Design a protein around this ligand. Structure first.
Ligand SMILES: N[C@@H](CCC(=O)O)C(=O)O
Ligand SMILES: [Cl-]
Ligand SMILES: [Cl-]
Ligand SMILES: [Cl-]
Ligand SMILES: [Cl-]
Ligand SMILES: [Cl-]
Ligand SMILES: [Cl-]
Ligand SMILES: [Cl-]
Ligand SMILES: [Cl-]
Ligand SMILES: [Cl-]
Ligand SMILES: [Cl-]
Ligand SMILES: [Cl-]
Ligand SMILES: [Zn+2]
Ligand SMILES: [Zn+2]
Ligand SMILES: [Zn+2]
Ligand SMILES: [Zn+2]
Ligand SMILES: [Zn+2]
Ligand SMILES: [Zn+2]
Ligand SMILES: [Zn+2]
Ligand SMILES: [Zn+2]
Ligand SMILES: [Zn+2]
Ligand SMILES: [Zn+2]
Ligand SMILES: [Zn+2]
Ligand SMILES: [Zn+2]
Ligand SMILES: [Zn+2]
Ligand SMILES: [Zn+2]
Lengths: 268, 270, 273, 272, 269
């Protein structure tokens, strides 16, 4: 919300344009409104499409996280329905699945998963997971071992193993999705072009408006400025949905909901 | 329609603009249409996009609900097709699937599912369901136990169990999808910014219009005001598709349809 | 075309604009182009977004019917490749799949399917289907019984059953999709808001145009009006793609195509040496 | 372009507008920019959305054809991986898969597939396929029989049969997708209505521009017309991606790509 | 490379100023209004186009994502299902890594021989370079490894099926990338817009001069920048497999894939 600084700067640019309107003819500078409508409308169209792309990206982040909840739910359900007896296996997989949620969060947030992982897994596993450059992936592999061992123990057939393997695939896609979102930002050129253009437009605007609106200039100018900046900053906040900002995803809340959901499903 | 108030208030502002037009040069105020055209078209573009995004949420909401009927239909079908004899299993599973629907509706409406659950299931189950933090997910698990037990008893093979398991996974996707839409709407910036913007534009508009239209100012002002507000409030409505507004989903109607479908003729089949 | 009444009314609205142009400022009423440019554009943006939604809905409808053909083709093909000898089963399943198509058509068209169902199926089955509150879904169940009986008999394994079952799932999605599109229209509020704004904008336009064009008003006002009315009525035809309008789906032809297709894949009287 | 006729008719309309503007006052017929500006922007928005839909259809066609390549590749891969010894089967299936591609291309183009089928299949099959009203569908069924026979011989299990059968479903989905996409006039005359709206706008525009640009009318008026006519005709092209009035290069290229690919995969190499 | 036209705009604006005094002398009028109409039209058309170009970029980024995902899970499956078959692990992983690099080369239209020799025995490198599509060949070879394990009875049809599905997924990636390479948005699009945006940008000062006088160049360059920025950004996103500044870092992505697959096989980069 550094926007209020930019709004103040606009009012200052407006009064400058008022006081210096007297010297217009003298300096030989003529500025009509029509060419600034053309520019403004274009910027609005471009901002419109840009804002759209940003929203889609935010939506995708939400979906991928939604999939974690879904896929981890059904995997646990599958475990209970196929092997209701093997509570030993349940606890191990549920922990791994809960670890995955937290590991992914920390990975995306660029924070330290050590505390959460130690809260969930034995140390032999925790140090092994943190040993991998890709810890979240390492958790999936370990979760895969449990299903694999259950198959080798003959407790799962190839079919029932396959039924569960699909859920690990689903989470692999989530990990992939999130990494792609995190590592690949919306092209820097989008923020580079638009911010330059919008800021300079808002700044130059009163100098074209002053000829027409005179004193009313500051009000009409700041209002158009507000509109364009608000739209522009919304797209900025949507672009990176894994940031810690107030407009972003409450990942902690989701990870807690996932953890509570799985522990609820095992009677813990 | 809370638009009518703002539409009426717009006519009041339009009278103010007519009577105060003479005094423009005295008060040192000049207002042309051109700047408001620029601002208006920009607001229209942004409203245009916003509304589209809202309709999307509505459409996805509707699709998620359509999947319930589809996946529930086929699961029953599969049961009727693979185990045509097991009517006791049929009835138990159906009642769960029906419970899932009503439970989901209550969840998204944040209302009490107790009445509907008792109507459908034994009390030992109603307490088990209301015990859970997520009752709808609990219902899925119970539905799952039924399919699971038919496999323990060797009535279902791994293959046919899987075929039916797939359908529960489908419902789980519906559950998660709906939660996504419900628990977190669009950003809160979207609503508070645009609503203020659209109305501040609407109130200032006559003051800029009066120069051109004079008396016809209130007419053309309320027209534009309507067009902009109509779109914003509709967008606002469709953003929460699980709410109780006019343009939202008839979830009650939908849950009936699901129920009637699953109990086709008291759950009978040749 | 009930659009042509609105164009005539536009001509008449232009004419009164021309003649009553005198008693304008004498009262004090003024109408310029720039404010109607803003409104017009706002309306054009809103129409554009709505039409987009309507087209999507039309595409989806076309897509869903597209799937019926794909799924029934493959289900018949699967029966041919897995159980090549069982032509009794073929004809039974084929007929149900044809029945499904016609039943679904009648359901969306809100017409009686008894004729078609009797043409295709024995009377016990027509009774069975019409007894259901959801007849088309009942046909799928019956189709599923055929596959299920072949599994009971051990002619199909659980795998081969599964392969065929998943095709019924496709048809189940089609049925659900179509029903959804039939009962969930583009929210009425859209069609309501746009219908009011477009009509009001078209009638007031020649009054806001007369100042600038004087006599040329009727010729310009109509051209603008027609544009907004054409684009609006395009959406109103695409939102209801199951009726018997000019823009709607030829569901009868498509049903024939499906009946033709399945009787092309079968129909080869087998065992003639 | 072939739209250079309407660009010339524009310049001719400009010259009419210049010379005749003198006799405008002696009636009281005027044309400002403001109304035609509104009309133009409105049309542009509509053209914008229409074009978007067209491009969408074009992309979907490219996807469906891309799937033929993918599915036909993986089916052949599966055959080599699961039944490496069964080359006679490899050959027959590959024949049908290549047949499917060409037969689909011909179907959508409404052109004669005889030559292409004759190069790939015995005249017995070619007659059978062309006897059917749905020849591409027939080829899929024939390819299916081949996979089915390997199963009945016990060479494929129900699982491995399933795996390959899935690929034939993909091709079936593609055939249907293409059939829908080729034979779907989503608007009846609304593609012509908007086209005529662009036509009239472009021919009335100089009469509205003359007051402001005078002689520079033809210069600006043709440029505006060019933009509108180009965008309209582009949407018209993308609308019908399988049209005889479209580009055949990509469709023929793909059929050759798939053929080259499938022969490479079975080591047969080029077919004469 | 745009700053050449940004300059040419200022020059054309100067021409517009110095030749404004000859305007009525020649009898040429240019108002802003008709250029607003044309400007907005182009802005709408650029707006949609840029949107389309983005989709291609996102799809390409998505397809490459699947490579990481599909290969990760394929290795995971090998480890979970055949934990003792480390010969198979290494061979398959080498093919998966080969596929990644070969795809990078395929799309960039470069020579894969360097990378192939680093990863595979020489007989295979020949077999691969012999094929019309080398990447497709690598998948077939990866498929042979799974197929061999099946005949040996180490994999059931079901477990073979599970692994096969991942090769199918990569085939889809191959097809997808191939489609985004070989088929750009047709010739028409760029030939229309690029010329149109240019001609508009250079003719705009002539129309702006009346209203703006000297301020012409400043306003005209501002509009021109906006229109050209958007136009060129769209062009960069259109071809996502190029080596341009705002394009997929395919070298970096292939490293990530290789590192991930090494990590999973208990090896070190
Ligand atoms: N393989 C071609 C021969 C022509 C050529 O390669 O030039 C055919 O028989 O159709
Ligand atoms: Cl437990
Ligand atoms: Cl997957
Ligand atoms: Cl438990
Ligand atoms: Cl289903
Ligand atoms: Cl029952
Ligand atoms: Cl799932
Ligand atoms: Cl007044
Ligand atoms: Cl038959
Ligand atoms: Cl061969
Ligand atoms: Cl995967
Ligand atoms: Cl390993
Ligand atoms: Zn799932
Ligand atoms: Zn347990
Ligand atoms: Zn223990
Ligand atoms: Zn630490
Ligand atoms: Zn389903
Ligand atoms: Zn029953
Ligand atoms: Zn007045
Ligand atoms: Zn299918
Ligand atoms: Zn038969
Ligand atoms: Zn595939
Ligand atoms: Zn071979
Ligand atoms: Zn002059
Ligand atoms: Zn995958
Ligand atoms: Zn190993």
């Amino acid at each position: 919300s550094k926007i209020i600084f930019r709004l103040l700067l606009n009012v200052l640019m407006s009064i400058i344009a008022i006081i210096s309107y007297q010297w217009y003819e003298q300096l030989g500078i003529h500025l009509t409104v029509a060419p600034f409508s053309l520019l403004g409308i274009a910027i609005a169209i471009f901002l419109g499409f840009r804002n759209s792309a940003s929203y889609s990206r935010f939506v995708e982040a939400r979906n991928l996280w939604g999939t974690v909840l879904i896929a981890e739910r059904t995997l646990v359900r599958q475990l209970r329905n196929i092997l209701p007896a093997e509570h030993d296996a349940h606890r191990r997989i549920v922990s791994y699945l809960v670890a995955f949620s937290w590991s992914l969060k920390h990975q995306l947030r660029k924070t330290d998963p050590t505390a959460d992982l130690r809260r969930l897994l034995p140390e032999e596993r925790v140090t092994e997971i943190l040993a991998s450059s890709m810890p979240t992936n390492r958790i999936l592999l370990l979760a895969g071992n449990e299903i694999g061992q259950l198959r080798e123990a003959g407790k799962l057939s190839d079919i029932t193993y396959g039924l569960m393997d699909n859920k690990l695939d689903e989470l692999a896609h989530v990990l992939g999705g999130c990494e792609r979102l995190a590592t690949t930002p919306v092209p820097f050129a989008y923020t580079l072009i638009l911010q330059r253009t919008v800021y300079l437009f808002c700044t130059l605007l009163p100098f074209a408006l002053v000829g027409d609106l005179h004193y009313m200039t500051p009000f009409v100018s700041v209002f158009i400025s507000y509109t364009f900046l608000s739209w522009d900053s919304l797209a900025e906040e949507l672009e990176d949905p894994f940031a810690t900002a107030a407009n972003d995803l409450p990942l902690n809340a989701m990870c807690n909901t996932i953890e509570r959901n799985l522990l609820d499903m095992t009677g813990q």
